[PDB]
Design a protein around this ligand. Structure first.
Ligand SMILES: [Zn+2]
Ligand SMILES: [Zn+2]
Ligand SMILES: [Zn+2]
Ligand SMILES: [Zn+2]
Ligand SMILES: [Zn+2]
Ligand SMILES: [Zn+2]
Ligand SMILES: [Zn+2]
Ligand SMILES: [Zn+2]
Ligand SMILES: [Zn+2]
Ligand SMILES: [Zn+2]
Ligand SMILES: [Zn+2]
Ligand SMILES: [Zn+2]
Lengths: 131, 131, 131, 131
DNA sequence: CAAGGCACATGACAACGGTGTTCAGTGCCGCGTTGCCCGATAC
DNA sequence: GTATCGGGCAACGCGGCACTGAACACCGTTGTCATGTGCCTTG
């Protein structure tokens, strides 16, 4: 995820960290990892870099029920929904043509000016269910 | 809106406000409406009664971008999703058989033990765009 | 370390950590220890409690060369001075009456109506020098 | 006022401004003085040249309560402790042998390999007390 | 019907855990500059 | 042989834009203390 602005070690390090993690992680959880790495990127810098890469669309952003937003790096450039397990903290990338068609059809039925479908699935995997 | 908690004048006043407005409203906004009525239900009372109704199932919960939870009363007890306009705060109930099937299919392919899917569409109204 | 206002678990949690620690530590450093302890006090909560305890005099505060203030609970509330080992991150309490008298005499020569005398020492122990 | 860095017009201007002031001055404030003179020396250049002079020991430094760095040029080459009035912002150099001996003695019994003793006094002068 | 018996209730505070804004302070990549450094010069 | 002269010069200056460290501010939610309101047997 190349940052749009002039490259610096801190922004490059957060970009590398997003590639290193394949799970949705909040800024506080990522900043703690970078502090343990010894990179020295500040919590405020981690917030600014995560927001810039997410605005570019390089990293996907999701919100939990608690209201804490989480950011993950996605291999697929194309838009897709996600099935996420809270216990794993990891998400699966899946895209639905039918759900997208249903959202457009619902917008057509109500004559809504624009469509911004937000389909997200939250389920726990069998491995986490086992204890 | 039947409330599981012991019956009191305060619970009835907030329940009346929920029935009065179909559109999603924040707990603070509902408290302000009760203050205007003269019911003067306490903010700590409005927050507790809204949350209690939600666990019972009388009210449905949604997340505004600002991150403030909003509560509305729904006539139908069947599973449904909401097509809501952020600009006008107007919510219309929408149901799709295909979205249920797609969510079930993603859960089945990944073999997650328990899965619950939350879906909503954000669009402006044709009347709203009209000037 | 007591806080003047009504006590809560979070105020007690930061106070317990300051009593447990025998060295000066920053708000961010103390917060990471508490997060691992599972107390779950927020960084803003760590800052508000630390500042209140320091005002009471329960915890003595020293300013580091970097400029990030570090807080520690001293053995006695009596006035004293500290010699800090940078490698240890811990200090030894030593007070000189003569230095206070010297500061008072020179302050009187200055003509100051009232004066505040502060002394700090930065060094390293013989054991810390060995590597 | 010698500068370790290669001599140039900008370095001549910052050194002259430091010579003119006999009180602790913020690096940004010295830059403000230089633009007022019309020297138009760069702020980044003012910061690096002040740091080089401080490393040389030509101009002394003090850490303020806010934590910003202030630089004062001193007539006396020999070591001393600055008594800076909080109200005036001006410092009079006073040296005490006893405080140095006390710091050395406590460090020696503690067994510290090396120690640096720093003493600062802050008070309002009788003239400043007058209003 | 009213006093008791008891509970659940309320509300006003007193708190808080996120994410966002000021800073002095410092990366950076272009510029410039200065005493040195040499090659002449025609005498 | 000296000496002043033009010009190049490469290892260094400079400045402006740009971006970063902690400490601090906001805002929807509560956790903790007290008391008035509601009902049920017992009289
Ligand atoms: Zn994705
Ligand atoms: Zn989609
Ligand atoms: Zn799982
Ligand atoms: Zn509904
Ligand atoms: Zn559904
Ligand atoms: Zn609309
Ligand atoms: Zn102490
Ligand atoms: Zn003292
Ligand atoms: Zn040591
Ligand atoms: Zn000095
Ligand atoms: Zn004064
Ligand atoms: Zn001394």
């Amino acid at each position: 995820p190349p940052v749009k602005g002039r490259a610096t070690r801190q922004r490059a390090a957060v970009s590398a960290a997003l590639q290193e993690v394949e799970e949705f992680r909040s800024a506080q959880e990522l900043h703690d990892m970078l502090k343990h790495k010894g990179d020295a990127v500040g919590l405020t810098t981690v917030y600014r870099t995560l927001q810039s890469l997410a605005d570019a669309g390089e990293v996907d952003v999701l919100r939990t029920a608690e209201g804490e937003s989480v950011y993950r790096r996605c291999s697929t450039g194309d838009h897709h929904h996600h099935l996420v397990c809270r216990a794993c903290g990891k998400a699966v990338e899946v895209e639905g043509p039918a759900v997208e068609k249903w959202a457009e059809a619902i917008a057509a039925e109500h004559g809504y000016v624009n469509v911004a479908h937000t389909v997200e699935i939250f389920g726990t995997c069998a491995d986490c269910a086992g204890a």
